[PDB]
Amino acid sequence: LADYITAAYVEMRREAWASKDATYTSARTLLAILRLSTALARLRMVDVVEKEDVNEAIRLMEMSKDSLRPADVIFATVRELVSGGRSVRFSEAEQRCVSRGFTPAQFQAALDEYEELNVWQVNASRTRITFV
């Protein structure tokens, strides 16, 4: 649970750094949340602290401080193949889109929908697409 605790502490300290009116979240806050987790573990009568105790401690600290479409997915998939090139092969994009769990009909529908916006142009041979 240390890694999750580290990530949660980083998130909380980043939030406290973004807000000027928040209390200074030094290592004392981490000590306090660790004490809260240990107290919760004692309360539940367990010799090992579980993630539920950490979640409850985070929730309590947050309450205390508070008291004060297929078209887009296919466009992103073909956007992943824009690594330094203006034109993308039709076969590669078709194979990659199908591997993501989309039927070729939805691929054609997404191609037409983003093609109406004229983001790109497709060759009639359906072999290459030049991105406008």
Binding site: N118, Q121, A124, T130, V132
Partner: protein, 364 residues
């Protein structure tokens, strides 16, 4: 040759006889003007549209059809007069132009206006219906608005027998440029020409190249689509097609080269072909801007940053005159902004291009 024939067909001045792409607007104008010609009563219409929509061509074709109908003794005879606003040295001289077109008399601007007023307000001899075409209306503006008021008020008179069509690019003109009484005179008679859809552009291109197999459908579709997405103008489409033919003389590659050569900016390549000292000057400007955060900087701080960069790079120590000459050369090609005629060390410098473009040009 086939390419030569395509070039001949695609020229701008090669006006077609009639394209049904605007047949609806043609029909509307054909009803309006026909009604104004049959009743021996004048009228006025305001037409606003972006350039390249074929407004002048459509009006001229309608005038051709009306003249043909008159030649076939179906419409009473009419006198046609055409004037262009931007082809006149002075605004008041339009009074002389119309008068000389109708009677050939030479008179002063005020006297020509008075004579035209007398002719159009007094019950004179029964004359043929007058068809007046005024081009580029917005350029006839005057602080007194007398010319515009007279132009759009004279056909209101019954004795005028005058039909006026005003072609302009801004549809807001009768609201924010024209005063209330004349705004109501042109009110509710505003024709707006929407830009051609890519289907319309493809139809126009196909009509240009009938019975000629010179271009592949893919190039044509892409050119029409770029035109739709950029301006929807037939003029630049014809220019792109001609350039594609020229490059083919030397596929989709030709159209792509035409579109990215006649539209793209040359700032990046100009910066790339710049000298080493100019690149160092640009880097010094960027560093000073990052240190300060302001978009204006005096020449002294830029000179200090340039000296520091030259010392870092091992370049020889530059003199103030050399840096000033380089800055003056850079300002000559409108890459910077400066007024070095009198001020030398206190010159404000502003970038003429975006910072990210400079970074993308200088990273390589």
């Amino acid at each position: 040759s086939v390419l030569e024939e395509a070039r001949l067909r695609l020229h701008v001045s090669a006006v077609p006889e009639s394209l049904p792409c605007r047949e609806q607007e043609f029909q509307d104008i054909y009803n309006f003007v026909e009604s104004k010609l049959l009743d021996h009563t004048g009228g006025c219409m305001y037409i606003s549209g972006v350039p390249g929509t074929g407004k002048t061509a459509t009006v001229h074709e309608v005038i051709r059809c009306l003249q043909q109908a008159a030649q076939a003794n179906d419409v009473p005879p009419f006198q046609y007069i055409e004037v262009n606003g931007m082809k006149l040295t002075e605004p008041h001289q339009v009074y002389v132009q119309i008068l000389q077109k109708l009677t050939g008399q030479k008179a002063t601007a005020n006297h020509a206006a008075e004579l035209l007023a007398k002719q159009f307000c007094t019950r004179g001899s029964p004359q043929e219906t007058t068809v007046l075409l005024v081009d580029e209306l917005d350029l006839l503006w005057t602080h007194k608005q007398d010319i515009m008021y007279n132009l759009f008020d004279w056909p209101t008179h019954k004795e005028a027998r005058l039909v006026v069509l005003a072609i302009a690019n801004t549809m807001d003109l009768p609201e924010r440029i024209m005063m209330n009484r004349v705004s109501s005179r042109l009110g509710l008679t505003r024709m707006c020409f929407q830009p051609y859809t890519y289907s319309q552009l493809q139809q126009i291109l196909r009509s240009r190249l009938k019975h000629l197999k010179a271009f592949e459908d893919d190039a044509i579709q892409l050119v029409a689509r770029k035109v739709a997405a950029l301006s929807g103008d037939a003029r630049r489409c014809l220019d792109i097609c001609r350039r594609a033919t020229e490059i083919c003389e030397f596929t989709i590659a030709h159209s792509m080269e035409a579109v990215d050569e006649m539209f793209s900016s040359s700032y990046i390549t100009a910066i790339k072909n710049s000298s080493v000292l100019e690149q160092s000057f640009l880097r010094a400007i960027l560093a000073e801007f990052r240190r300060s955060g302001l978009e204006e900087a005096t020449f002294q701080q830029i000179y200090s940053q340039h000296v520091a960069l030259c010392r870092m790079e091992g370049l020889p120590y530059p003199t103030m005159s050399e840096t000033m000459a380089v800055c003056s050369h850079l300002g000559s090609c409108r890459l910077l902004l400066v007024e070095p005629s009198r001020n030398d060390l206190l010159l404000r410098v502003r970038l003429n291009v975006s910072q990210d473009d400079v970074l993308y040009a200088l990273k390589d």
